[PDB]
A paper describes a structure:
Echovirus 30 ([name]), one serotype of the species EV-B, has emerged as one of the leading etiological agents of aseptic meningitis and caused extensive seasonal and periodical outbreaks throughout Europe, Asia and South America in recent years. Furthermore, [name] is reportedly associated with other diseases like viral encephalitis, acute flaccid paralysis, hepatitis, and even acute diarrhea. As with many other EV-Bs, [name] is believed to utilize two types of receptors to gain entry into host cells: CD55 for viral attachment; and FcRn for viral uncoating. Neutralizing antibodies could possibly target different steps of viral infection, including blocking viral attachment to the cellular receptor, interfering with viral uncoating via over-stabilizing or destabilizing the virus and physically damaging and/or aggregating the virus.
Residue numbers in the entry:
A (entry chain D): 2 to 13, 24 to 68
B (entry chain A): 9 to 284
C (entry chain C): 1 to 238
D (entry chain B): 11 to 261
E (entry chain L): 1 to 221
F (entry chain H): 1 to 120, 125 to 206
Write the structure that this text describes.
């Protein structure tokens, strides 16, 4: 039941093993390693796509 | 590549074309995606920086104090009573409220940790031997039997969850699932309570969260002792929707969102700069 | 039983720990989530959409709508200064209660490049150009347009397209700069000058308007989370 | 290009000058799926009767004007079969296509900000008093902002540099916004989907969003030019469906 | 808590000249603070309101002579210029952040017209036969023409001082020559009245180092 | 405006049921009430007939809008003998009544009793009559049958167990005194009793 994942290391032995003890999904620890993102819903919320090299109007 | 690491700066050079990366039109509501290579001559720089600290889990996932409950072992008035309730909400402290108000609809599993201290009340004498006190914190769901006073029938917790903490141990801690009625916590509810558009306005109507009754388990001490219970919240498994703009004017009331009228920023002398 | 030993750091309450904890309502049935539009997974998605800045924040214009309106007039001699401020996006009086400023005050360090988008708001028949310089802090803030043309600058020509973007670079000896900045991590100075003039046909008013924006590019980052020095309180709100 | 041509039901909109159509948070409005619903009754779906362009009342843009706000779906409560099916129901789920338009000249100047803020919980004009429901929004009237502090008794706070919600007015650009700059632009068009934390909600006890039009750069012209330039807002519901039939409301 | 040490300092002003009131707070200082003057006719006379830095709201009666500003932790009120008639007694009041409620009213000071300082002049007169049969004795002495109230008054009856049943009063400003005056009402018995021969009235000033002696004849008819 | 005019004044007994009525010109409700004993004013109630925190159990219903009846000072405990005010709160210009006091000290009427002083002297002749030991503090002092009401110095009376003392100093030259006739007249509001006394000449 053990799950081995990587550790938050620097940039140029590094694993950690967590085991869920309790029988609830809300009683687990934090998953701090979801860095995914998509800013296209706030920066470019347009219907017709605008390319940078093209003129805008 | 990996996920979350920032983009790079590709190298460029002197250009002379009909392309206009600089010019744009903000009337479309479209923020420009201008890479710094599109304006000047940049070098190839590898960016190893990450956006780990700016995720919603690392931004909200820290403990913050919410409510400071006071209750003693001898009743002297109706604010230092033998027991003390708290209508459970995240809007009474200022620093956690401004973080939760940055998004409209949130959805988090809560995590509550109490730190409970004590201090003898001021009197004419202090010498007494007392065993270590036991504090009881009973969650009351919305629509349950509330304890009217001490030694009540409803302090038995036949279905309510509760803790029993001896002074001097590790602080109590328990996790709470997401327990709204809808699909998200509404941090902003522009609307009324009744269908006639009257009654109470704001997000007060959707704050049906229960209560939290603090008391001592011990019958009495020799001399009266005041206790303080500080409640810390830590939202985990957070999913936030519809980001708001962060509130500028400071808060006034714990129910609604009223405010003084404030200026936009701090002032300065002039619009220019006057040194060489 | 199994012989354990309490290490230093036991029975403590660290504020930023991630430990498991026993649930209070076991086998709770949560309410199923739905596709709600506008989800955020990162604070830099909020700090990447633009927001206007109060460049005209001389007293008393901060508690009014004339804080964002930069006055632009037909000059009588070219090379004057339209405005100017320091590039401290967490401590300057201009860029700290904006959207990029109100996020970066929650953190202690920042990095990357910003985008100052300038949008004209005058008549359709008014023309003219501007010079928007950015001088890194070698020899102080520049004095005139000749002394600012040596730095990083763009010459925005107001025309059919209504708005240009000066993209400030990332020129620093440190990989991160503090928001409440000291003298070790100075960033630079932003000026904006009249290139030629503002010329008009007759029956057009003199005063025009330029709205400045601020954003972040695709390589912005923050670090070292804190609490913001923007909201204070004495007691609990009741 | 600049030319757009919107058509919904039997009432179209033709604009020679436009910027682009910002669509919500990047999603087109659609009906409720079978795995997100909570009701069990079969909903009604009038597609030509409700999903059409309704033109609201006109407002006047002068030099010393502060701004205006409409609250939806209260501003469409008396317009056609949209406001008649609103009274005979309990739940509603619509998306919108807000089309604000203002033409002056090639000699005028000015700039608006057409934004749609979901859950615009407004602060009161005076604190420690709940206010009247007719001072947030009426059935068709455009409630206006002010330049100074509103020392009212049963109204909202209409400080234009605070936008009624206590936030600085500059940071309203996170919400789906467009600028009507009279130098280039003429009309702003936004397509905003149904944004709520529940699948379907009542339409009288909950104003979903608030269309705000705020002049940032004030309007200047020569005195010889035409001094009356209006701002007309035509809003069209989109993908409307209703549930929970009932008698006539609304109380 | 909530301590207001309002409102130093005003003594005394010239008609047409300036003074600067002040008020301090120690509770939640970013409130909706204002002022409230008062004169003993009631006569409300509200004068100013400010919230929170800008938006000063002077009244229509005095719209161009006051000025309030803050802060911090204290706030002032400058007057240019005072004119008689004027209050009186000035109070520093507060509210919460809405809020035209006026709670939290602290103590306050006074300010009046400008005169030269003048010593109080006391004079005593023979009584009538209206207090004889009742067993009492109401000896009459009316002072005249003093300013300000930094004086002293005494009742030395032929070398015998009386503090039992004495009466003290201070009038407001009379409108013929801007004078002030006090009164005297005594309550003696029968056996103590005729023990003396001529009652003596004295009053001191801060300028004069000696009281004024006035003698009347009781048995004169 | 025009506030109010509240009437005023109240009356004994503190057994209960005291009412204070006012009028207005608009003003749909924003009225308050304020009372003071010897200090700066207190504050009850709020911008309604709703209660305040810290005030006593008397919380009066006030009708809407321009009548606001009443204070409803039920079950007095003789602490509340004070002077009440009533603000309106619709700028411009937020002025009060400012009502009338209510102490009034049961029960007897106490018609007026005077002890007139006769001056006997110098270049000025000062004259005043000692209205002594009266219950009702309202009076109306009239000198020289309605001609010498200019130099009258109205003095504060002092309470020592239901007795008051007003005195009105009038100053004449020696062109009338001691030849002509001088007499102070008191029009009495509460009991309507007439006093007339002549200064004896030497
Ligand atoms: C005392 C034994 C442990 C039980 C602890 C108490 C359980 C209650 C936890 C509260 C659950 C969160 C409810 C929502 C909180 C805020 O009001 C929302 N953000 C506003 O709707």
């Amino acid at each position: 039941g053990a799950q081995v994942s990587t550790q938050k290391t620097g940039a140029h032995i590094i694993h950690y093993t967590n085991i869920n003890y309790y029988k609830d999904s809300a009683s687990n620890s934090l998953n701090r390693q979801d860095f995914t993102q998509d800013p296209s819903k706030f920066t470019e919320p347009v219907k017709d796509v605008m390319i940078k090299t093209l003129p805008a109007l | 590549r990996a996920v979350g690491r920032v983009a790079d700066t590709v190298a460029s050079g002197p250009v002379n074309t009909e392309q206009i990366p600089a010019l744009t039109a903000v009337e479309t509501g479209h923020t420009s995606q201008v890479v710094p290579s599109d304006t000047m001559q940049t070098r190839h720089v590898i960016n190893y920086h990450t956006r780990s600290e700016s995720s919603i889990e690392n931004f909200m996932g820290r403990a913050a104090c919410v409510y400071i409950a006071q209750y003693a072992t001898e009743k002297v008035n109706d604010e230092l009573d033998r027991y003390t309730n708290w209508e459970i909400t995240t809007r009474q402290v200022a620093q956690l409220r401004r973080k939760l108000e940055m998004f409209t609809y949130m959805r988090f599993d809560l995590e509550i940790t109490f730190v409970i201290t004590s201090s003898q009340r001021t009197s004419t004498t202090y010498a007494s031997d007392s065993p270590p006190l036991t504090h009881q914190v009973m969650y009351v769901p919305p629509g349950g039997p509330i304890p009217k006073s001490y030694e009540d029938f409803a302090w038995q917790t036949s279905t309510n969850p509760s803790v029993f903490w001896t002074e001097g141990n590790a602080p109590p801690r328990m996790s709470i699932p997401f327990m709204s009625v809808g699909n998200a916590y509404c941090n902003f509810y522009d609307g009324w309570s009744h269908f006639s558009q009257s009654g109470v306005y704001g997000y007060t109507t959707l704050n049906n969260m229960g209560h939290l009754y603090f008391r001592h388990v011990n019958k009495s001490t020799a001399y009266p002792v005041n206790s303080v219970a500080r409640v810390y919240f830590k939202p985990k498994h957070v999913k936030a929707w519809v980001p708001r703009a962060p509130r500028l004017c400071p808060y006034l009331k714990a129910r609604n969102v009223n405010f003084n009228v404030q200026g936009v920023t701090e002032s300065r002398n002039k619009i220019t700069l006057d040194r060489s | 039983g199994l012989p354990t030993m309490n290490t230093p750091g036991s029975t403590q309450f660290l504020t930023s720990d991630d430990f498991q904890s026993p649930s209070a309502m076991p086998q709770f049935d949560v309410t199923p989530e739905i596709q709600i539009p506008g989800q955020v997974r990162n604070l830099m998605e909020i700090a990447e959409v633009d927001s206007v800045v109060p460049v005209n924040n001389t007293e008393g214009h901060v508690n009014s709508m004339e804080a964002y309106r930069i006055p632009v007039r037909p000059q009588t001699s070219s090379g004057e200064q339209v405005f100017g401020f320091q590039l401290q996006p967490g401590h300057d009086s201009v860029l700290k209660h904006t959207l990029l400023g109100e996020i970066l005050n929650y953190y202690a360090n920042w990095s990357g490049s910003m985008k100052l988008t300038f949008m004209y708001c005058g008549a359709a028949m008014a023309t003219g150009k501007f010079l928007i310089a950015y001088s890194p802090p070698g020899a102080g803030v520049p004095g005139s347009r000749r002394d600012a043309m040596l730095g990083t600058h763009v010459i925005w020509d107001v025309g059919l397209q209504s708005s240009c973007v000066l993209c400030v670079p990332w020129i620093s000896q440190t990989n991160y700069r503090y928001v409440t900045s000291d003298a070790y991590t100075d960033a630079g100075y932003i000026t904006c000058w009249y290139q030629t003039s503002i010329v008009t046909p007759p029956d057009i008013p003199t005063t025009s308007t330029i709205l400045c924006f601020v954003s972040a590019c695709n390589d912005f980052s923050v670090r070292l989370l804190r609490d913001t020095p923007f909201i204070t309180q004495q007691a609990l709100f009741q | 290009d600049r030319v757009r041509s919107i058509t919904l039901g039997n009432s179209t909109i033709t604009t020679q000058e436009c910027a682009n159509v910002v669509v919500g948070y990047g999603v087109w409005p659609t009906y409720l799926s079978d795995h997100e619903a909570t009701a069990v009754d079969q909903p009604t779906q009038p597609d030509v009767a409700t999903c059409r362009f309704y033109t609201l009342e006109s407002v006047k843009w002068e030099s010393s004007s502060a701004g205006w706000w409409w609250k939806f779906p209260e501003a469409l409560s008396d317009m056609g079969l949209f406001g008649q099916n609103m009274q005979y129901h309990y739940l509603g789920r619509t998306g919108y296509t807000i089309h604000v338009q203002c033409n002056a000249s090639k000699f005028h100047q000015g700039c608006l900000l057409v934004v749609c803020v979901p859950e615009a919980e407004m602060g009161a004009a005076t604190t420690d008093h709940a206010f009247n429901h007719t001072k947030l929004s009426n059935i068709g009237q455009a409630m206006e902002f002010s330049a100074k502090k509103s020392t009212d008794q049963t109204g909202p706070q209409t400080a234009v540099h605070n936008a009624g919600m206590g936030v600085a007015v500059g940071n309203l650009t996170i919400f789906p916004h467009q600028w009507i700059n009279l130098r280039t632009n003429n009309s702003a068009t936004i397509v905003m989907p149904y944004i709520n934390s529940v699948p379907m909600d009542n339409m009288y006890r909950h104003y979903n969003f608030t269309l705000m039009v705020i002049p940032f750069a004030k309007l200047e012209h020569s005195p010889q030019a035409s001094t009356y330039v209006p701002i007309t807002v035509t809003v069209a519901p989109m993908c409307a469906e209703y549930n929970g039939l009932r008698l006539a409301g609304h109380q | 808590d909530i301590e207001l040490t309002q409102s130093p300092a005003t003594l005394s002003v010239t008609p047409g000249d300036s003074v600067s009131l002040s008020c301090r707070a120690s509770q939640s200082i970013s409130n909706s603070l204002h002022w409230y003057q008062q004169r003993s006719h009631e006569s409300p006379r509200r004068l100013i309101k400010t919230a929170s830095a800008e938006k000063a709201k002077s009244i229509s009666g005095i719209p161009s002579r006051f000025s309030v500003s803050r802060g911090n932790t204290s706030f002032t009120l400058s007057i240019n210029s005072v004119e008689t008639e004027d209050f009186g007694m000035y109070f520093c009041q507060q509210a919460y952040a809405g809020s035209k409620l006026q709670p939290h009213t602290g103590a306050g000071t006074k300010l009046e017209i400008k005169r030269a300082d003048a010593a109080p002049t006391v004079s005593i007169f023979p009584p009538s036969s209206e207090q004889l049969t009742s067993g009492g004795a109401s000896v009459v002495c009316f002072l005249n023409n003093f300013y300000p109230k930094d004086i002293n008054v005494k009742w030395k009856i032929d070398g015998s001082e009386r503090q039992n049943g004495v009466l003290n009063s201070w009038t407001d400003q009379d409108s013929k020559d801007s004078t002030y005056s006090m009164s005297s009402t005594l309550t003696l018995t029968k056996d103590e009245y005729e023990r003396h021969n001529s009652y003596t009235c004295e009053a001191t000033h801060k300028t004069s180092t000696s009281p004024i002696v006035k003698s009347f004849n009781r048995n004169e008819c | 405006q025009v506030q109010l005019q509240q009437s005023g004044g109240g009356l004994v007994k503190p057994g209960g049921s005291l009412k204070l009525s006012c009028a207005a010109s608009g003003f749909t409700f924003s009225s308050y009430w304020m009372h003071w004993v010897q200090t700066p004013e207190k504050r009850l109630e709020w911008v309604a007939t709703i209660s305040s925190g810290g005030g006593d159990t008397y919380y009066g219903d006030s009708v809407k809008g321009p009548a606001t009846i009443s204070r409803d000072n039920a079950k007095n405990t003789l602490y509340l003998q004070m002077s009440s005010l009533k603000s309106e709160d619709t700028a411009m210009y937020a002025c009060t009544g400012a009502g009338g006091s209510t102490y009034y000290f049961d029960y007897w009427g106490q018609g007026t009793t005077v002890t007139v002083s006769s001056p006997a002297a110098a270049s000025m002749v000062t004259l005043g009559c000692l209205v002594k030991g009266y219950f009702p503090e309202p009076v109306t002092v009239t000198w020289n049958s309605g001609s010498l009401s200019s130099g009258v110095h109205t003095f504060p009376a002092v309470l020592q167990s239901d007795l008051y003392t007003l005195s009105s100093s009038v100053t004449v030259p020696s062109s009338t005194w001691p030849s002509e006739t001088v007499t102070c007249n008191v029009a009495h509001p509460a009991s309507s009793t007439k006093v007339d006394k002549k200064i004896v000449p030497r």
